[PDB]
C-alpha cells in the first residue's frame, strides 16, 4: 500500500492522507517527525514520471481531497512542472501545521472575480479539506510559451538601453505598465475588504525589522558589513516611526512582489507566484499586509535589475543604467498612483511606509546573500548608497 | 506760463515716439514720470491706439523732443534709481550708481551710461491692460531670489497696470567683453574636436548650464506654480500639430521626405500630452538657448527675458512648463554640435557627436541635482521632454524655410538620433 511504503519529502515518516492517481501515481500528505507536513508527489515524482500529468487528468475527469477544475511534462524550479507545454502544475513542498496554507487560491479567485486578467489562466486546484484548516496542495494554471520572467526581460531591456538600441522612454514603458498592472491587482484584491493595522501589528513590524537588521549587521562581512553597520543607526531610526503609523490599511497582497514574478510574452504581462513570501512563516503568508509592501518590493527589484546589469555586462556604460534605476521607480510610482486614482482606490496606498519598508527590503537582500548567494551583498550595498544619504538629508531638514 | 507735458506732446510731431516708418497723429500723453531738469519718461499713445515709451527732454528750440544719447535722460533715470507718480513703479537693486556719460548702442533702444550700465527703453508697448513683455517680472524675481548668473540689474521702470507691470525701461550692468553661446560653445566643441580640450573639459559648460537653469527656475518658481488644465494641454497639441503640418508642407528636398515619414510618429508622441494634465506651470525664460548665455572668465549670464518671439505678444507672459526651457537648451546644445561638424573643415565628427549625447546628459544631471539641492524637484516634469523636444526641432524647420533655408539639416540630423 502507501502508508507503510527520510529525504523523500525533499525534492532531489508517517502518512496522513493519500490521493491515489492510479498506475502507481499518488499525491501524498506526509508528516515528518518534527510535525512538518509535506506534499510529496509519489510515483518522489520527478519531472517526466507522469504524476503531474496524472494530476491534470484526475482534475479533468473529476472526501479528504478536493479536485477543482475550470474550463509529456517538463519541470522547472515549491516545484513547478509544465504539463504538455500548456499547463503549469505547481506543488506545495512545505505545508503548515494542523495552520493557514498557501493563499494563492484566494488571491487568484479574487483577481478573476474582479476582472483582473493580467495573469495566466487558471486550470485546476487541489486542496486538502480534511483538517481544521484547508491547505492548498497544488495549483494548475495555463503555461505561457516563450514567456520570460522579469529577471530576463527587464535585464535585457536595460542592456539594450545601455547599448543604445532603446530610448529611455522605451525602457521606462515596461516600468510604467507594471505600475498600472499593480494598481489593478491591488484594486481587485482590496475588494475582499480592508483591515486597519492595530498598534500591536505595527509594533510586531518594528521588532521583526529591527531583528533582521541586527542579523544582517552581525553576518555581512568585510567592507560591506562596515558600511552597513554605520548605516544601521540611521535605518533603526526610520524603523522607530512605524509606531505612529497604526491604522494603515491592510489588504490581500501579492506578498512576494518582484520582477521575477512578472512574465512577459508577446508584449503582454502576467503576474505569477501568489504563494506568499517564503521567508515568512506558513501561518503568516495569508495574512493581510500593506499594499506598499508590494510597491516597495517591485521598486527595489527594479533598482536591483540595474545593479545586475552593471555587475554582469562587460563594457557596460553604467550612466544610462543608473539613470534608468531612478526613472523606472518614478515611472512605476507615477503610473501606480494615477491608476489608483482612476480606480478610486487611493486609500489603500500609504506612502509613509515607502522608506521604512524599502530599507527592510534591502536588509533582506543582505540576509538572502549570506544564506544563499554570498556575493549578492553588492546589490543592497549599492542601493542603500544612493538611497540612505538622500533620505537622511530630508529628515535633517 | 510754461505749458505742461501733455500740451507739448499733443503739439509734437508723431515721429516723437520713434528713435523709416510713419506714425499717425496727433499724440496723446497717458502718463509722465518727471525725472527733473527737463527730463521725463512719457507713455505716449498715437492716433492708431499704439502706446510708446518715449524718453522726453524739453528743448528751447522746439519745446519738446525725444531724448538722444547725450541729452542726459538715461543718466537721470539711473540717478533716480540711486536714491513719484502713482502710475509708475521705480525699483532699484543693489549696485545701481549715478554714473554719467551716454553712448548709443544697438542690442529696443539701448543707451550705455557710464560705460558700465545699459539703459533699454521699451519703445513699443502693449495696449492698456493687455499683457506685454514679462522681462521686468522675470528679472525682479531672479534678483529677489538670489540669482546672480545674469547681468547685475540696477533698476526697473514699470507702469502700474494690468495683471503684470508693463516694462518701460530696464537698467543692467554692461558687459563689453562677453560672447554669447553660439560663439563660446561652438569654440569649445571645435577645440574638443582637434584635441585642444578633453571631453571632461568640454562637458563642464553643459553641466554649468544645467545648474544655472535650475537656479533660475527655482527663483522663478518662488512666485508660484499653476497646475496645467485639460484645456491647456489640449491647446498645446493643437499648436504643435499645426506647426508640424506647416513644416511637412514646406520643407523641401530629402529633409522634407524624411520629415513626412516621421510626421505620423511625431504626432503619436504629441497625443500623449492629454495625460499630462496637472503638470506644473511657472514663470520661465521662454526663449532659452545657448545664444542667451554670455560667458567670460568662467562666469555665466543669461539675458533676453521678453519671451518667445514667434508666440503672440499677449501670451509670452503666461506660465509654461519648466521642461520647455530644459528642452530649448538641450536642443540648442545638440545644434551646437551639428553646426561644428557642418562648418568646420577637416573636423572629426566622432568626438563632436559623442559630445552631443554627453552634453545633454551632463545638463540634465546637473539640472536635476541642483533642483534637488534647492528642494525644487516638483517644477520639472520630465514626461514632457520627448514631446516638447520634437516640437522644438519642428520649429527649426519653420525657422529654416522662413529665414535660412539650408538650416533644415540641423533638425534633420537631430531627429535622426532622437527617433528609435
Ligand atoms: N503559467 C506560466 N507560464 C509560463 N511560465 C511560468 C508560469 N508560471 C510561472 N512561470 C515561470 O516559472 C518561474 C517560477 O515560478 P514561480 O511560481 O514564481 O515559482 P516560485 O514561486 O517557487 O518562485 C517564473 O520565473 C516564471 O517565469
Ligand atoms: N529578495 C528576494 C531574493 O531572493 C532575490 O532578489 C529574488 C530571487 O530569489 O527574490 C526576492 O524575493
Ligand atoms: Cl549577480
Ligand atoms: Cl549653418
Ligand atoms: Mg516566484
Ligand atoms: Mg514563490
Three-state SS annotation for chain A? CCCCCCHHHCCCCEEEEEEEEECCEEEEEEECCCCCEEEEEECCCCCCCCHHHHHHHHHHCCCCEEEEECCCEEEECCEEEEECCCEEEEECCEECCCCCCCCHHHHHHHHHHCCCCCCCCEEEEEEECCCCCCEEEEEEEECCCCCECHHHHHHHHHHHHHCCCCCHHHHHHHHHHHHHHHHHHHHHHHHHCCEECCHHHHHHHHHHHHHHHHHHHCCCCHHHHHHHHHHHHHHHHHHHHHHHHCCCEEECCCCCCCHHHEEEECCEEEECCCCCCCCCCCCCCCCCECHHHHHHHHHHHHHHHHHHHHHHCCCCCHHHHHHHHHHHHHHHHHHHHHHHHHCCCHHHCCHHHHHHHHHHHHHHHHHHHHHHCHHHHHHHHHHHHHHHHHHHHHHCC
- CA A49 vs. chain centroid, Å, equals 28
- What was the elucidation method? X-ray
DSSP letter at B15 equals G
How far is Cα A3 from Cα A16, in angstroms, rounded to an integer? 8
Ligand closest to A307 (CA) is 3
Tell whether residue A142 is among the known ligand binding residues: yes
> Which residues, chain by chain, have CB under 5 Å from ion ligand 5?
A 273
Helix (H, G, I), strand (E, B) or coil at B178: coil
Asked if B394 and B240 touch (Cβ cutoff 8 Å), the reply is yes
Quick one: which of A9, A18, A26, A347 has its CA closest to A190? A347
Please tell me the distance from the alpha carbon of residue A81 to that of residue A93, in angstroms, as a whole number: 13
Shortest CA gap A64–chain B (Å): 54
Euclidean distance between CA atoms A3 and A28, whole angstroms:
9
CA distance A55 to A83: 10
Q: Do B386 and A169 touch (CB under 8 A)?
A: yes
Residue B7 touches chain A, beta carbons under 8 Å? no
Q: Which ligand is nearest to the CA of A155?
A: 3
Task: Quote the CA–CA distance of B274 and B235 in Å, as a whole number.
Answer: 10
Contact A261 CB / ligand 1 (< 6 Å): yes
- Sign of the CA dihedral with B356 first, then B358, B363, and B367 last: positive
Write the residue in B361, B386, B418 that is nearest to A319 by C-beta: B361
Residue B290 contacts residue B302 (beta carbons within 8 Å): no
Cell of B205: 559648460
**B353 and A CB contact within 8 Å:** no
User: How far apart are the C-alpha atoms of B10 and A187, rounded to whole Å?
Assistant: 73
Residue A87 bridge partners (DSSP): A83, A142
Task: Note whether B361 contacts A167, CB cutoff 8 Å.
Answer: no
Are B103 and B115 in contact by the 8 Å Cβ rule? The answer is yes
| CA-CA-CA-CA dihedral for A388, A389, A390, A394, to nearest 10 | 100
Fold for the domain defined by B181-418: Aminoglycoside 3'-phosphotransferase; Chain: A, domain 2 (3.90.1200)
**Cis peptide, bond prior to residue B26, ω within 30 of zero:** yes
Element (H, E) at B16: none
Which residues are registered as beta bridge partners of B300?
B295
Q: Which long-range contacts (CB under 8 A, 24 or more apart) does A230-235 make?
A: A231/A384, A231/A388, A234/A388, A234/A392, A235/A359, A235/A363, A235/A388
**Taking a C-beta distance cutoff of 8 angstroms, is the pair A147, A133 a contact?**
no
Determine the residue of chain A that is closest to B369 in CA distance: A390
Q: Are B382 and A323 within 8 A, CB to CB?
A: no
- Whole-number Å distance, alpha carbon A69 to ligand 1 midpoint, is 20
Which one-letter DSSP state was computed for residue B295? E
Q: What is the resolution of this structure in A?
A: 2.1
Q: What is the DSSP letter of B110?
A: E
Scanning every residue of chain A, which has its alpha carbon at the shortest distance from the alpha carbon of B419? Answer: A167
Cα–Cα distance measured from residue A233 to residue B410, given in angstroms and rounded to the nearest whole number: 54
- Ligand 2 and A260: CB distance under 6 A: yes
* Number of Cβ atoms within 10 Å of the Cβ of A335: 21
Taking contacts as CB-CB distances below 8 angstroms, the residues of chain B near A323 are: 361, 365
Q: Please calculate the CA angle B176-B178-B183 and round it to the nearest 5 degrees.
A: 135
- Alpha-carbon gap, residue A163 to A309, rounded angstroms: 11
CATH of domain A150-396: 3.90.1200.10
State how far residue A327 is from chain B, nearest Cα, in angstroms: 9
Closest residue of A to B418, CA-based? A167
Residues A366 and A221: their CA atoms lie apart, in Å, by 10
Long-range own/partner contacts, residues B412-417 (CB < 8 A, 24 or more apart): B412/B255, B412/B258, B412/B259, B413/B338, B414/B331, B414/B334, B414/B335, B414/B338, B415/B258, B415/B259, B415/B262, B415/B390, B416/B258, B417/B334, B417/B356, B417/B357
How many Å lie between the alpha carbon of A323 and the closest alpha carbon of chain B?
9
Tell me how far the alpha carbon of residue B304 is from its chain's centroid: 3
B60 touches chain A (CB under 8 A): no
Cell 534678483, located at residue: B143
- Please answer whether residues A67 and A53 qualify as being in contact, where contact means their C-beta atoms are separated by less than 8 angstroms: no
User: Residue A260 CA: which ligand 1 atom is closest?
Assistant: 25
Q: Is A98 on the interface with B (CB under 8 A)?
A: no
Compute, in angstroms, the gap from residue A161 CA to the centroid of ligand 5: 26
Grid cell listed for B412: 534633420
Give the Å distance between the CA of A234 and the centre of ligand 3. 27
Among B368, B333, B5, which residue's Cα sits nearest to residue B217?
Answer: B368
Look at the alpha carbons of A302, A307, A308, A313 in this order and tell me if their dihedral is positive or negative.
Answer: positive
Q: What are the CA-CA distances from residue A47 to residues A52, A74, A88, A120 (Å)?
A: 8, 6, 12, 21
Q: Edge-to-edge strands of the sheet including B102-105?
A: B88-92, B153-159, B166-173, B117-121, B109-113, B102-105
Contacts of A197 (CB under 8 A, 6+ apart): A245, A246, A247, A248, A249, A250, A290
Amino acid at each position: 500500500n502507501w502508508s507503510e511504503l527520510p529525504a523523500l519529502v525533499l525534492p532531489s515518516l508517517r502518512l496522513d492522507a493519500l490521493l491515489d492517481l492510479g498506475e502507481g501515481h499518488a499525491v501524498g500528505v506526509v508528516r515528518s517527525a518534527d510535525a512538518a507536513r509535506w506534499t510529496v508527489p509519489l510515483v518522489r515524482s520527478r519531472p517526466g514520471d507522469g504524476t503531474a500529468e496524472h494530476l491534470v487528468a484526475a482534475l479533468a475527469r473529476r472526501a479528504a481531497f478536493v479536485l477543482e477544475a475550470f474550463t509529456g511534462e517538463r519541470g522547472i524550479i515549491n516545484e513547478s512542472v509544465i504539463v504538455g507545454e500548456c499547463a503549469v502544475v505547481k506543488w506545495a513542498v512545505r505545508l503548515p501545521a494542523e495552520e493557514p496554507g498557501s493563499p494563492a487560491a484566494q488571491r487568484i479567485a479574487a483577481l478573476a472575480r474582479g476582472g483582473f486578467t493580467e495573469m495566466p489562466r487558471p486550470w485546476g486546484l487541489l486542496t486538502l479539506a480534511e483538517g481544521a484548516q484547508p491547505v492548498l496542495l497544488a495549483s494548475v494554471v495555463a503555461y505561457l510559451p516563450g514567456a520570460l520572467d522579469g529577471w530576463d526581460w527587464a535585464v535585457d531591456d536595460v542592456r539594450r538601453l545601455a547599448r543604445g538600441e532603446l530610448t529611455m522612454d522605451q525602457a521606462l514603458l515596461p516600468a510604467a505598465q507594471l505600475g498600472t498592472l499593480t494598481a489593478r491587482m491591488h484594486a481587485a484584491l482590496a475588494a475582499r475588504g480592508r483591515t486597519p493595522a492595530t498598534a500591536a501589528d505595527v509594533a510586531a513590524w518594528g521588532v521583526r525589522m529591527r531583528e533582521e537588521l541586527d542579523e544582517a549587521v552581525a553576518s555581512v562581512p568585510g567592507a560591506e558589513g562596515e558600511r552597513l553597520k554605520a548605516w544601521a543607526p540611521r535605518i533603526a531610526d526610520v524603523y522607530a516611526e512605524l509606531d505612529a503609523l497604526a491604522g494603515t490599511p491592510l489588504i490581500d497582497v501579492h506578498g512576494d512582489f518582484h520582477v521575477g514574478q512578472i512574465l512577459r510574452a508577446d508584449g503582454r504581462y502576467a503576474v505569477v507566484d501568489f504563494d506568499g513570501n517564503p521567508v515568512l512563516p506558513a501561518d503568516q503568508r495569508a495574512a493581510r499586509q500593506p499594499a506598499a509592501l508590494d510597491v516597495v518590493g517591485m521598486t527595489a527589484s527594479l533598482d536591483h535589475v540595474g545593479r545586475v546589469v552593471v555587475f554582469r555586462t562587460p563594457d557596460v556604460d553604467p550612466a544610462p543604467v543608473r539613470a534608468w534605476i531612478a526613472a523606472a521607480q518614478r515611472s512605476f510610482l507615477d503610473a501606480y498612483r494615477t491608476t489608483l486614482a482612476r480606480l478610486d482606490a487611493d486609500d489603500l496606498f500609504d506612502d509613509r511606509l515607502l522608506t521604512p519598508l524599502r530599507y527592510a527590503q534591502e536588509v533582506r537582500e543582505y540576509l538572502y546573500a549570506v544564506r544563499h548567494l554570498p556575493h549578492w551583498v553588492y546589490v543592497p550595498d549599492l542601493s542603500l548608497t544612493d538611497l540612505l544619504p538622500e533620505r537622511l538629508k530630508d529628515k535633517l531638514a
